[PDB]
C-alpha cells in the first residue's frame, strides 16, 4: 500500500497561492497529483492543479477566484501503477 503525503501547507505572499507538502525518500520517483476545490458561494468538483509532478510544491494561482469562497486542497502520491490516499488539507480564505 503506497505512503500518504504529509504536512500539507498552503502559502500565499501576495495573491500567488502555492501548496507545499512533505514526503519520504523512496528508491523510486514519487510523483504527486494536486487537486483544489472552492466552496461557499459555489460548490465545484475537485479540479486538477498539478498532475504528476516530482517536486513538493504546486502553484495554484489560476484556480483562485471570488475571494468569498474558501479553497480546500488534497494531494495523493503515485509510484508505478499504485496510488496513495488523499492527504486532505484544511481551509484557506484570505491571503
Amino acid at each position, epitope marked *: 500500500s503506497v505512503p500518504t503525503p504529509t504536512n500539507v501547507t498552503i502559502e500565499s505572499y501576495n495573491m500567488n497561492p502555492i501548496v507545499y507538502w512533505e514526503y519520504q525518500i523512496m528508491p523510486q520517483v514519487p510523483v504527486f497529483t494536486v487537486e483544489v*476545490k472552492n*466552496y461557499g458561494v459555489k*460548490n*465545484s468538483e475537485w479540479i486538477d492543479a498539478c498532475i504528476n509532478i516530482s517536486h513538493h510544491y504546486c502553484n495554484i494561482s489560476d484556480h483562485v477566484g471570488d475571494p468569498s469562497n474558501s479553497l480546500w486542497v488534497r494531494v495523493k502520491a503515485r509510484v508505478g501503477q499504485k496510488e496513495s490516499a488523499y492527504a486532505k488539507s484544511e481551509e484557506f480564505a484570505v491571503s
Partner: antibody
Framework: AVKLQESGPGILKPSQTLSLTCSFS??????????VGWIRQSSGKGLEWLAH???????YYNPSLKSRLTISKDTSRNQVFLKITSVATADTATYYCARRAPFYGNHAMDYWGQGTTVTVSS | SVEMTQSPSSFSVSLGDRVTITCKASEDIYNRLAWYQQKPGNAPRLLIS???SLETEVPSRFSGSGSGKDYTLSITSLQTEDVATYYCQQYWSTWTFGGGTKLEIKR
C-alpha cells in the same frame, strides 16, 4: 411568495430532444449566489441530479449525462431551461427544478416545483 | 464523483419507535448534507441541511447528525405523518442523492 413550476411536453418520442421549462417567481436569478437545478426521478426509483445554473451563467452538469444536457437561463422571463437530446425510453420520468437555499455554505434545495412527468414512447 | 449509500431501500418500523436512517458518503463531505422526505406523488420536502440544521416548521422529533462520511437521521416517535421515503444528499461537490429509505410499518 417563492414558487417554482416545471413545464414539459407530456409525451415525446425517442431520438427527439426534450425542452423543459422552470418558471419561478418570488426571487431573482440575478441576485448574487442564486442558482437553480434539475433533478429527475422514475417510478419507484431514486432521485437523479441533472444540471444546475448559477446567477453568473456558470453551469454544472451531471457527468453521466453532460453530453446530452444544455442548461440556460433568461432573467427577463424568469425561467431556467433544460434541453435533452437523443431522448431514450429510460428517460421517462418526472422532472423537477429547485433553487439553492439562499445561505452561504448552504446548497441544499429549499423550494421545489411540483414536477412534470414526461413519457418517452412511440 | 462522490457516492452516497443509504441502506437499505426500506425499513420495517412501527409507530412510536425511534428510527435512525443511515447515510454513508464515499469521502469526507464536510457536513454539507441535506435530508429530504418524500410522500408518494409529491415533491421532496427539505428537512435538514448542514447535517444538523432543521428547516423551520419541521417537528422536533426529527434530528440529524454524524460527520466525515457518516450521517444519520433520527425520528424519536414515528407518527403516520412521518411514513415516507427519506433521502440524504451531499452538496459539497455539486449534488448527489442517496438511494432512499422507504418506511414501511410492521404488523
Amino acid at each position: 411568495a417563492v414558487k417554482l413550476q416545471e413545464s414539459g411536453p407530456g409525451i415525446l418520442k425517442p431520438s427527439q430532444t426534450l425542452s423543459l421549462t422552470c418558471s419561478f417567481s418570488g426571487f431573482s436569478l440575478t441576485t448574487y449566489g442564486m442558482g437553480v437545478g434539475w433533478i429527475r426521478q422514475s417510478s419507484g426509483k431514486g432521485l437523479e441530479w441533472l444540471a444546475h445554473i448559477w446567477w453568473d451563467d456558470d453551469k454544472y452538469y451531471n457527468p453521466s449525462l453532460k453530453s446530452r444536457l444544455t442548461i440556460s437561463k433568461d432573467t427577463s422571463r424568469n425561467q431556467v431551461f433544460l434541453k435533452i437530446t437523443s431522448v431514450a425510453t429510460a428517460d421517462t420520468a418526472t422532472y423537477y427544478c429547485a433553487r439553492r437555499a439562499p445561505f452561504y455554505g448552504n446548497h441544499a434545495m429549499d423550494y421545489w416545483g411540483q414536477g412534470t412527468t414526461v413519457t418517452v414512447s412511440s | 464523483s462522490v457516492e452516497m449509500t443509504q441502506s437499505p431501500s426500506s425499513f420495517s418500523v412501527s409507530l412510536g419507535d425511534r428510527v435512525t436512517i443511515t447515510c454513508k458518503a464515499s469521502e469526507d463531505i464536510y457536513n454539507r448534507l441535506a435530508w429530504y422526505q418524500q410522500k408518494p406523488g409529491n415533491a421532496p420536502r427539505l428537512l435538514i441541511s448542514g447535517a444538523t440544521s432543521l428547516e423551520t416548521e419541521v417537528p422536533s422529533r426529527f434530528s440529524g447528525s454524524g460527520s466525515g462520511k457518516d450521517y444519520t437521521l433520527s425520528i424519536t416517535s414515528l407518527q403516520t405523518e412521518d411514513v415516507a421515503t427519506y433521502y440524504c444528499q451531499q452538496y459539497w461537490s455539486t449534488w448527489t442523492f442517496g438511494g432512499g429509505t422507504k418506511l414501511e410499518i410492521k404488523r
